[PDB]
């Protein structure tokens, strides 16, 4: 028992991290097979970031201008191309530690682990979620760009995020591994305000099921509700609308605990209306929304 | 910017995890050089756990009764010995992935990463602290025994914890890598109640400095206090006493932010007395105590 914000083991991804330098800019790259992927803004000076024309800036760079170092050894760059907001640097050596992998584009509410890196070296691993406004609340400093987000299914790493920037508000933005930003963000030093960061309802419900499974049951009430009644309350509290697809996804947790999804919705409705009254659930004084229903099942069953 | 509960990258430790089976009991082991370390209760049946005499049970086991599998390959056991509550299984092959390592015994309040494993396979990584009552609040299921806790300093892994059991109250107990339990716990199915789980004051203060560094400043007040006055309040709120050694350890964070340690103590005193009033600090509605001052410096400076 116990329930922790758990990240995937990071070894398979540590084996892919490299340092990429272009001129005076250094950041991280992801080396898979004979390609290193990195944010295209590696070609920019800080002055370029104000109004960059990436195609024009890229014309001034040749393969030898991209310095890629894996551990303490240099990789030879034999090609380069830009795909949306990422650069793909073809190297002459396949990464011998390339795991089985896929590139996936996640939806808001989905969680993933981040391996925060600097200079191609791992600093730490944490778990987060793609927020409903397409930002992530990470822990990243200058030089962390190119650090990646991923999920693992047994031996296959699904890369879903590459870090590109911090918005003026201190939240983070990035792309999938095809170089497409999540949300409306652009890799430019311009006004980019984020939309409403709503609470991921289906994940809160999953976490209340995790709380019941782990014996924290005080919040269970004698009520039920309907999807429409619950959603009226969810809207008022800036929670995402709960759909029948979300109810279906919670079916395994409902079956495990014997608590109908709509009864748990009624317990969540009361928590929103009454507050916590100084109590905690799974050691939190707020309702946690960065565990998906699959995360709860995975952690509560010991998937490896 | 941003501040996350961050674990160390787990790759170096994933390379050390093996499965150990004795009879019908399977758990995890840690393979370093030519020794596999695991909880001694691998020799017990569930019935044995009620009143085990480990020396007597161990007499009935030979080297061939310990099955050690690393990946999908069997290791040959050429010796076995019990050291306190751990077994050391000498194998004929040194682990080729053995990192630079040390065995350390940590003090309450110190944090470490756990690589939760099942059947010698990694499931996830999370960060936790040795509680002042010598328990850890982990996420562990049956079969997780032998999973380890560690810290990393560049390329040296300091192992500090090996998981042995879950107390009847759902909190966790284990040993250092010499097999000595943290706290008064024993590897027996008997009454073992934990003492007061007090809040680690020096870590809360570190985290309030992290909050200031990351721009969450609302809780800073116009007051100061003394160690003795602060400790009167800390005692009332089940917080650990703050010592001058703790003040000294917070000196780098005090210097970075320009906030005297005793002024931050006065802000914490007001938070304890007034509550949060529905506000959050670093996305938490409670005061977080599982970041040490070194963790805050490490995360805020991007150490790799
Ligand atoms: C600084 C940081 C922190 C966390 N995550 C990521 C990052 N880095 C970024 O955001 C990349 C970036 C993007 C834009 Cl639009 C401008 C710049 N300018 C350069 C500098 C003035 C040093 C800064 N900041 C750099
Ligand atoms: C179950 C678990 C969960 C989390 N962390 C660790 C563990 N496992 C343990 O505590 C090991 C342990 C120690 C004692 Cl004193 C007795 C037993 N009995 C066996 C069984 C009835 C299956 C159970 N439980 C097993």
XYZ file of C-alpha atoms and ligand atoms in Angstrom:
658
model
C 0.000 0.000 0.000
C 0.887 3.720 -0.251
C 0.513 5.987 -3.278
C 3.280 8.091 -4.683
C 3.765 10.429 -7.636
C 5.860 7.856 -9.474
C 7.903 8.320 -12.601
C 8.929 5.574 -15.024
C 12.464 4.187 -14.490
C 14.652 6.517 -16.589
C 17.527 4.275 -17.634
C 16.308 3.629 -21.175
C 16.037 7.376 -21.771
C 19.326 8.260 -20.008
C 21.000 6.087 -22.658
C 19.673 8.471 -25.332
C 20.707 11.841 -23.956
C 23.385 13.832 -25.729
C 24.628 17.427 -25.737
C 24.077 19.532 -28.860
C 25.964 22.793 -29.357
C 25.540 25.235 -32.200
C 27.819 28.220 -31.962
C 27.341 29.557 -28.442
C 24.048 27.720 -27.671
C 24.133 24.341 -25.926
C 21.173 22.176 -25.069
C 20.132 18.525 -24.933
C 19.391 16.174 -27.747
C 17.739 12.769 -27.982
C 19.797 10.171 -29.901
C 17.679 7.323 -31.392
C 19.150 5.111 -34.094
C 21.329 7.494 -36.204
C 19.304 10.650 -35.557
C 19.676 13.252 -32.836
C 16.515 15.302 -32.212
C 16.729 18.717 -30.525
C 14.890 22.058 -30.349
C 15.532 24.136 -33.466
C 16.307 27.164 -31.281
C 19.766 25.593 -30.697
C 20.708 27.682 -33.807
C 19.706 30.956 -32.180
C 21.595 33.459 -30.165
C 19.561 35.090 -27.319
C 19.219 38.143 -29.649
C 17.804 35.880 -32.423
C 14.991 34.665 -30.105
C 13.231 38.045 -30.267
C 12.236 37.585 -33.924
C 13.784 34.416 -35.409
C 13.389 33.325 -39.025
C 14.452 29.749 -38.515
C 14.704 28.892 -42.216
C 17.003 31.860 -42.774
C 19.100 31.185 -39.678
C 19.398 27.526 -40.590
C 20.849 28.410 -44.058
C 23.924 29.789 -42.266
C 24.574 26.434 -40.536
C 26.337 23.385 -41.977
C 26.592 19.826 -40.520
C 29.975 20.726 -38.919
C 28.335 23.611 -37.012
C 26.305 21.115 -34.896
C 28.498 19.611 -32.194
C 27.000 16.483 -30.702
C 28.670 14.836 -27.758
C 27.476 11.523 -26.225
C 29.229 11.007 -22.908
C 32.704 12.380 -23.568
C 32.816 11.349 -27.250
C 31.946 13.380 -30.297
C 29.454 12.168 -32.883
C 29.912 12.968 -36.556
C 27.013 14.914 -38.108
C 26.345 13.832 -41.677
C 23.009 15.561 -42.267
C 20.597 18.030 -40.758
C 17.002 18.950 -41.348
C 14.278 20.929 -39.677
C 10.913 19.291 -39.005
C 8.490 21.838 -37.568
C 10.250 23.110 -34.376
C 12.815 20.322 -34.079
C 16.099 19.684 -35.780
C 17.013 16.183 -36.818
C 20.780 15.716 -36.962
C 21.797 12.568 -38.834
C 24.901 11.074 -37.292
C 27.216 8.393 -38.645
C 26.691 6.079 -35.656
C 23.509 4.433 -34.467
C 22.992 4.781 -30.744
C 23.909 1.375 -29.396
C 21.571 1.955 -26.428
C 18.526 2.796 -28.592
C 15.509 1.246 -26.859
C 12.341 0.100 -28.644
C 10.512 3.381 -29.188
C 7.610 5.262 -30.647
C 6.748 8.911 -31.075
C 3.357 9.755 -29.672
C 1.352 12.970 -29.403
C -0.569 12.985 -26.107
C -3.844 14.664 -25.214
C -4.400 17.046 -22.269
C -4.763 15.195 -19.033
C -2.215 12.517 -19.962
C 0.729 12.072 -17.695
C 4.348 11.337 -18.515
C 7.781 11.257 -16.924
C 10.378 13.936 -17.652
C 14.121 13.306 -17.503
C 15.436 16.825 -16.827
C 18.925 17.179 -18.355
C 21.675 19.780 -18.671
C 24.625 19.500 -21.053
C 23.417 16.080 -22.163
C 23.548 14.821 -18.546
C 20.612 13.673 -16.422
C 19.765 15.669 -13.348
C 16.452 14.143 -12.290
C 13.164 12.507 -13.089
C 9.668 13.654 -12.265
C 6.158 12.969 -13.243
C 3.783 15.509 -14.716
C 0.717 15.989 -16.921
C -0.113 17.784 -20.126
C -2.370 20.526 -18.679
C -5.752 21.286 -20.322
C -4.197 24.610 -21.506
C -1.313 22.641 -23.196
C 1.378 23.775 -20.764
C 3.298 21.560 -18.344
C 4.274 22.563 -14.834
C 7.844 21.258 -14.828
C 11.127 22.088 -13.140
C 13.428 23.390 -15.797
C 16.291 25.872 -15.894
C 18.174 27.452 -18.826
C 19.939 24.639 -20.635
C 17.159 22.106 -19.933
C 15.807 22.448 -23.481
C 15.702 19.191 -25.350
C 14.912 17.225 -22.131
C 12.139 14.753 -22.983
C 8.891 13.394 -21.621
C 7.928 9.777 -22.085
C 5.895 6.782 -21.014
C 7.000 3.128 -21.064
C 4.995 0.000 -21.947
C 7.222 -2.958 -20.817
C 10.258 -2.389 -23.115
C 8.876 0.285 -25.493
C 9.490 3.947 -24.782
C 6.840 6.289 -26.140
C 8.354 9.746 -26.344
C 5.703 12.436 -26.130
C 7.400 15.687 -25.215
C 10.552 17.683 -25.849
C 11.078 20.783 -23.719
C 11.480 24.075 -25.617
C 10.672 26.985 -23.389
C 9.441 28.689 -20.317
C 6.566 31.127 -20.824
C 6.763 34.581 -19.195
C 4.451 33.132 -16.466
C 6.880 30.379 -15.401
C 5.008 27.408 -16.923
C 6.485 25.259 -19.672
C 5.885 24.649 -23.355
C 7.212 22.136 -25.788
C 6.586 19.871 -28.701
C 5.988 16.262 -29.609
C 8.962 14.467 -31.288
C 7.661 15.586 -34.694
C 8.385 19.150 -33.592
C 4.764 20.306 -33.270
C 4.089 22.395 -30.196
C 1.444 21.385 -27.753
C -1.005 24.255 -27.689
C -0.654 27.547 -29.501
C 2.873 28.323 -28.396
C 5.731 29.409 -30.634
C 9.471 29.261 -30.138
C 9.819 33.062 -30.029
C 10.341 35.606 -27.226
C 6.887 37.128 -27.628
C 3.645 37.592 -25.618
C 2.208 34.148 -25.039
C -0.322 33.969 -22.239
C -1.746 30.609 -21.248
C -5.446 29.794 -21.117
C -7.310 28.500 -18.064
C -5.531 25.735 -16.286
C -8.536 23.638 -15.377
C -8.449 20.599 -13.134
C -8.407 17.187 -14.868
C -11.557 15.693 -13.409
C -11.164 12.108 -14.580
C -7.671 12.069 -12.960
C -9.014 13.440 -9.662
C -11.606 10.657 -9.654
C -8.878 8.090 -10.381
C -6.869 9.427 -7.452
C -9.945 9.271 -5.130
C -10.234 5.572 -6.157
C -6.488 5.185 -5.325
C -7.249 6.809 -1.928
C -10.048 4.247 -1.258
C -7.812 1.335 -2.326
C -5.096 2.579 0.020
C -7.626 3.027 2.946
C -8.218 6.781 2.946
C -11.989 6.663 2.893
C -13.227 9.601 5.053
C -14.538 11.575 2.047
C -16.944 8.875 0.847
C -20.444 10.171 1.354
C -23.957 8.715 1.172
C -24.824 10.507 -2.104
C -24.920 9.949 -5.818
C -25.305 12.383 -8.727
C -25.716 12.364 -12.517
C -23.189 13.411 -15.155
C -25.180 16.561 -15.899
C -25.543 17.552 -12.241
C -21.883 16.808 -11.528
C -20.765 18.814 -14.575
C -22.729 21.871 -13.446
C -20.575 21.812 -10.277
C -17.370 20.910 -12.180
C -17.870 23.945 -14.456
C -18.294 26.213 -11.408
C -15.003 24.937 -9.934
C -12.959 25.104 -13.184
C -12.874 21.315 -13.476
C -12.995 19.751 -16.947
C -16.372 18.264 -17.986
C -16.667 14.556 -17.262
C -17.862 12.537 -20.222
C -19.280 9.016 -20.560
C -15.867 8.090 -22.101
C -14.276 9.145 -18.753
C -16.848 7.074 -16.833
C -15.955 4.065 -18.998
C -12.234 4.573 -18.407
C -12.894 4.546 -14.651
C -14.776 1.212 -14.884
C -11.823 -0.958 -13.704
C -11.382 1.225 -10.580
C -15.142 1.231 -9.952
C -15.125 -2.581 -10.218
C -12.104 -2.984 -7.937
C -13.556 -0.791 -5.171
C -17.280 -1.489 -5.670
C -17.931 2.299 -5.779
C -20.016 3.404 -8.767
C -18.395 6.197 -10.765
C -21.345 8.523 -10.164
C -21.172 7.889 -6.404
C -17.488 8.930 -6.488
C -18.559 12.000 -8.520
C -20.974 12.834 -5.705
C -18.170 12.532 -3.149
C -15.989 14.814 -5.304
C -18.928 17.296 -5.640
C -19.156 17.457 -1.830
C -15.358 17.948 -1.490
C -15.542 20.862 -3.933
C -18.486 22.446 -2.111
C -17.425 21.775 1.500
C -13.633 21.917 1.096
C -11.262 19.574 2.936
C -11.901 21.098 6.403
C -8.185 20.755 7.195
C -8.097 17.070 6.359
C -5.878 15.277 3.819
C -6.361 12.529 1.213
C -3.231 10.459 0.415
C -1.193 13.106 2.247
C -2.514 15.940 0.092
C -4.597 18.913 1.172
C -5.709 19.508 -2.419
C -7.296 17.172 -4.932
C -4.523 15.695 -7.095
C -5.039 15.538 -10.833
C -1.767 14.275 -12.258
C -2.605 10.528 -11.998
C -4.576 9.051 -14.863
C -6.865 6.058 -14.336
C -4.210 3.892 -16.072
C -1.547 5.236 -13.682
C -3.662 4.259 -10.701
C -4.184 0.735 -12.038
C -0.508 0.428 -12.961
C 0.782 1.591 -9.581
C -1.784 -0.342 -7.549
C -0.986 -3.592 -9.482
C 2.839 -3.333 -9.646
C 3.329 -3.332 -13.427
C 7.033 -3.595 -14.417
C 11.793 27.854 -12.824
C 9.256 25.418 -11.301
C 9.808 23.012 -8.411
C 9.052 19.343 -8.557
C 9.423 16.338 -6.265
C 12.340 15.009 -8.294
C 14.017 11.649 -8.036
C 17.564 10.835 -9.141
C 17.848 9.249 -12.620
C 17.470 5.509 -11.918
C 19.526 3.912 -14.677
C 22.576 3.132 -12.549
C 20.367 1.315 -10.040
C 18.206 -0.446 -12.673
C 21.447 -2.101 -13.815
C 21.757 -3.693 -10.356
C 18.314 -5.186 -9.874
C 17.903 -8.943 -9.850
C 15.251 -11.442 -8.755
C 16.002 -13.701 -5.786
C 13.871 -16.773 -5.101
C 14.175 -19.121 -2.166
C 11.688 -21.945 -2.243
C 8.320 -20.286 -2.795
C 9.380 -16.711 -1.844
C 10.539 -14.301 -4.549
C 11.740 -10.767 -4.049
C 14.323 -8.316 -5.374
C 18.026 -8.271 -4.845
C 20.751 -5.701 -5.438
C 23.745 -7.037 -7.416
C 26.998 -5.073 -6.802
C 30.322 -6.594 -7.798
C 29.916 -10.358 -7.057
C 27.415 -9.990 -4.212
C 23.634 -9.938 -4.302
C 22.036 -8.281 -1.255
C 18.418 -9.046 -0.316
C 16.099 -9.150 2.715
C 16.755 -12.239 4.831
C 13.011 -12.955 4.937
C 13.397 -14.377 1.386
C 14.013 -17.680 3.295
C 10.648 -17.554 5.037
C 7.292 -18.915 4.153
C 4.330 -16.656 5.161
C 3.835 -19.057 8.137
C 7.509 -18.553 9.169
C 7.001 -14.752 9.412
C 4.885 -15.114 12.565
C 7.865 -16.199 14.691
C 11.005 -16.681 12.558
C 14.348 -17.885 13.901
C 16.423 -16.752 10.970
C 19.600 -18.565 12.025
C 17.681 -21.829 12.290
C 15.797 -21.320 9.030
C 18.997 -20.385 7.243
C 20.670 -23.700 8.302
C 18.157 -25.517 6.075
C 19.258 -23.525 2.995
C 22.264 -24.189 0.757
C 23.737 -21.976 -2.034
C 21.668 -23.900 -4.648
C 18.441 -22.995 -2.800
C 18.909 -19.282 -3.712
C 17.879 -18.684 -7.311
C 19.183 -15.404 -8.653
C 18.131 -14.240 -12.074
C 19.510 -11.070 -13.750
C 17.389 -10.268 -16.783
C 16.563 -13.703 -18.166
C 19.863 -15.329 -17.116
C 20.642 -17.288 -13.999
C 23.539 -16.392 -11.726
C 25.506 -19.080 -9.923
C 25.482 -18.751 -6.116
C 28.810 -19.740 -4.599
C 28.306 -18.479 -1.047
C 25.722 -17.058 1.299
C 25.814 -15.251 4.591
C 23.492 -13.301 6.812
C 24.488 -9.817 7.968
C 21.900 -8.463 10.397
C 18.602 -8.538 8.391
C 20.132 -8.938 4.936
C 21.475 -11.902 3.067
C 24.595 -11.543 0.992
C 24.682 -14.076 -1.836
C 28.128 -14.403 -3.407
C 27.820 -15.086 -7.107
C 30.453 -16.258 -9.571
C 30.043 -13.215 -11.838
C 30.665 -9.577 -11.052
C 27.857 -7.335 -12.210
C 29.237 -5.719 -15.331
C 26.960 -2.705 -14.738
C 28.161 -2.111 -11.152
C 28.319 1.666 -10.679
C 30.670 3.448 -8.264
C 28.898 2.971 -4.941
C 28.855 3.382 -1.211
C 26.653 2.119 1.581
C 25.383 4.904 3.774
C 23.104 5.025 6.810
C 20.958 8.176 6.651
C 19.444 10.226 9.452
C 15.745 11.156 9.790
C 14.820 14.010 7.547
C 17.133 12.904 4.727
C 15.589 12.259 1.379
C 16.354 9.581 -1.182
C 14.981 8.057 -4.362
C 13.359 4.619 -4.386
C 13.357 2.335 -7.422
C 10.274 0.193 -6.733
C 10.775 -3.267 -8.284
C 8.905 -6.553 -8.647
C 10.503 -9.814 -9.774
C 13.811 -8.029 -10.284
C 12.155 -5.582 -12.723
C 11.746 -1.831 -12.267
C 8.257 -0.451 -11.996
C 8.898 3.156 -10.993
C 10.916 5.780 -9.214
C 9.847 8.188 -6.516
C 11.337 10.445 -3.981
C 10.791 10.180 -0.254
C 12.277 10.930 3.170
C 13.330 8.962 6.203
C 10.582 10.116 8.616
C 11.506 11.270 12.157
C 9.842 8.030 13.425
C 12.156 5.953 11.105
C 9.403 4.867 8.720
C 9.098 5.825 5.055
C 5.839 6.599 3.306
C 6.431 4.663 0.089
C 4.361 2.889 -2.535
C 5.091 -0.773 -2.217
C 3.142 -3.967 -2.825
C 3.907 -7.608 -1.935
C 7.003 -8.580 -3.876
C 8.557 -5.093 -3.632
C 10.926 -6.226 -0.869
C 14.549 -5.709 -1.714
C 13.756 -2.510 -3.712
C 16.355 0.097 -2.726
C 16.659 3.748 -1.817
C 19.631 5.801 -2.902
C 21.185 9.169 -3.604
C 23.704 10.002 -6.350
C 26.719 12.344 -6.245
C 27.815 12.714 -9.940
C 28.746 9.057 -10.701
C 28.647 7.536 -7.182
C 25.502 5.844 -5.940
C 25.041 5.925 -2.181
C 22.600 3.190 -1.262
C 20.789 3.974 1.966
C 17.692 1.812 2.130
C 16.437 -1.660 1.301
C 12.703 -2.263 1.647
C 11.668 -5.063 4.033
C 8.121 -4.582 5.164
C 4.875 -2.800 5.546
C 3.770 -2.139 9.124
C 0.167 -2.940 10.123
C -0.510 0.835 9.699
C 0.469 0.935 6.005
C 3.809 2.763 6.395
C 7.121 1.183 5.449
C 10.188 -0.128 7.229
C 13.549 -1.265 6.045
C 17.251 -1.395 6.585
C 20.495 0.154 5.452
C 22.670 -2.059 3.159
C 24.385 -3.500 6.246
C 21.024 -5.012 7.177
C 20.312 -2.795 10.198
C 16.742 -1.578 10.399
C 15.986 2.080 10.580
C 14.135 2.558 13.833
C 13.044 -0.158 16.216
C 11.398 -2.398 13.660
C 11.937 -6.129 13.277
C 11.352 -8.438 10.347
C 8.555 -10.332 12.128
C 4.743 -10.315 11.863
C 4.264 -8.775 15.298
C 2.824 -5.593 16.902
C 4.986 -2.713 15.763
C 3.381 0.685 16.153
C 5.193 3.742 14.862
C 6.017 6.797 16.950
C 4.963 10.364 16.149
C 5.509 11.318 12.576
C 6.631 14.881 13.121
C 7.200 17.409 10.371
C 10.825 17.966 9.276
C 11.148 21.661 9.998
C 14.469 22.355 8.304
C 13.041 20.786 5.090
C 9.883 22.919 5.265
C 12.083 26.007 5.560
C 14.159 24.834 2.580
C 10.976 24.411 0.557
C 9.740 27.924 1.562
C 13.103 29.230 0.217
C 12.451 27.208 -3.001
C 8.991 28.870 -3.143
C 10.589 32.367 -2.886
C 13.194 31.511 -5.552
C 10.421 30.311 -7.855
C 8.285 33.496 -7.180
C 5.683 32.228 -4.717
C 6.149 34.919 -2.114
C 2.670 35.654 -0.635
C 3.500 34.054 2.741
C 6.471 36.315 3.506
C 5.519 38.485 6.434
C 6.998 41.525 8.185
C 8.106 39.545 11.275
C 11.113 37.837 12.743
C 11.465 35.429 15.677
C 14.172 33.659 17.696
C 15.049 29.962 17.707
C 13.525 29.549 21.164
C 10.293 31.357 20.279
C 9.985 29.491 16.980
C 10.599 26.136 18.690
C 7.825 26.769 21.217
C 5.449 27.001 18.220
C 7.127 24.100 16.355
C 6.622 21.849 19.407
C 2.920 22.793 19.542
C 2.488 21.843 15.862
C 4.461 18.548 16.013
C 7.338 20.030 14.020
C 10.889 18.925 14.845
C 12.977 21.414 16.878
C 15.120 23.684 14.729
C 18.732 23.821 15.824
C 21.590 26.221 15.052
C 23.012 23.382 12.862
C 19.774 23.610 10.785
C 20.128 27.408 10.576
C 23.692 26.946 9.303
C 22.578 24.409 6.700
C 20.026 26.937 5.423
C 22.719 29.639 5.029
C 23.157 29.169 1.234
C 19.383 29.581 0.680
C 19.282 32.581 3.031
C 22.164 34.136 1.061
C 20.574 33.425 -2.324
C 17.217 34.976 -1.379
C 18.401 37.652 1.079
C 15.857 36.351 3.652
C 17.361 35.699 7.089
C 16.637 32.208 8.395
C 14.841 33.577 11.455
C 12.638 35.791 9.262
C 11.623 32.671 7.286
C 10.974 30.941 10.646
C 8.631 33.811 11.500
C 6.797 33.359 8.196
C 6.494 29.614 8.902
C 5.242 30.394 12.471
C 2.479 32.563 10.969
C 1.546 29.841 8.419
C 1.214 27.329 11.260
C -0.914 29.694 13.351
C -3.067 31.216 10.583
C -3.232 28.250 8.188
C -3.081 28.629 4.402
C -6.531 30.288 4.090
C -7.183 28.246 0.934
C -3.998 29.383 -0.755
C -1.153 27.233 -2.121
C 2.662 27.387 -2.086
C 4.399 25.668 -5.043
C 1.056 24.036 -5.869
C 0.683 22.522 -2.406
C -1.987 23.249 0.181
C 0.211 21.808 2.933
C 3.770 22.609 3.925
C 6.078 20.130 2.169
C 8.856 18.526 4.162
C 10.449 16.001 1.834
C 12.994 18.419 0.258
C 16.226 18.914 2.148
C 18.184 22.166 1.877
C 20.690 20.313 -0.369
C 17.820 19.130 -2.600
C 16.616 22.691 -3.018
C 20.094 23.914 -3.962
C 20.621 20.948 -6.282
C 17.311 21.357 -8.104
C 17.489 25.150 -8.293
C 21.070 24.990 -9.739
C 20.651 22.079 -12.203
C 23.256 19.669 -10.810
C 23.798 16.626 -13.094
C 15.244 29.904 -19.429
C 14.551 28.567 -19.423
C 13.992 28.066 -18.254
C 13.219 26.922 -18.303
N 12.979 26.242 -19.431
C 13.575 26.677 -20.548
C 14.355 27.830 -20.596
N 14.861 28.302 -21.828
C 14.033 28.872 -22.727
O 12.882 29.209 -22.459
C 14.613 29.042 -24.117
C 14.442 30.467 -24.587
C 13.287 30.857 -25.255
C 13.107 32.187 -25.580
Cl 11.639 32.671 -26.381
C 14.051 33.149 -25.275
C 15.228 32.754 -24.645
N 16.221 33.682 -24.375
C 17.506 33.397 -23.767
C 17.630 33.813 -22.289
C 17.516 35.337 -22.167
C 18.938 33.317 -21.667
C 16.516 33.211 -21.548
N 15.634 32.729 -21.018
C 15.411 31.419 -24.297
C 2.863 -6.966 1.734
C 3.868 -5.872 1.486
C 3.454 -4.614 1.068
C 4.369 -3.580 1.008
N 5.662 -3.720 1.324
C 6.083 -4.946 1.657
C 5.230 -6.042 1.761
N 5.713 -7.285 2.230
C 6.015 -7.446 3.534
O 5.695 -6.637 4.401
C 6.816 -8.691 3.858
C 6.154 -9.467 4.972
C 6.451 -9.189 6.301
C 5.755 -9.837 7.302
Cl 6.108 -9.453 8.963
C 4.774 -10.770 7.025
C 4.504 -11.082 5.696
N 3.568 -12.054 5.382
C 3.226 -12.503 4.047
C 1.884 -11.971 3.508
C 0.731 -12.509 4.364
C 1.680 -12.334 2.034
C 1.893 -10.508 3.619
N 1.943 -9.378 3.731
C 5.189 -10.421 4.679
